[PDB]
Amino acid sequence: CKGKGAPCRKTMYDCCSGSCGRRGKC
């Protein structure tokens, strides 16, 4: 899975830890 503040795909459960949160980065 991803990691932090990388470009992330909000709806598709993109992030390894937290989530593609308000800022639209992982």
Curated annotation (Swiss-Prot):
Compartments it resides in: Secreted
Tissues expressed in: Expressed by the venom duct.
GO MF term set: calcium channel regulator activity; ion channel inhibitor activity; toxin activity
One cellular component term from this protein's GO annotations in UniProt: extracellular region
Disulphide connectivity of cysteines: 1-16, 8-20, 15-26
SUPFAM superfamilies to which the protein is assigned, alphabetical: omega toxin-like
Protein's UniProt name: Omega-conotoxin MVIIC
Originating organism: Conus magus
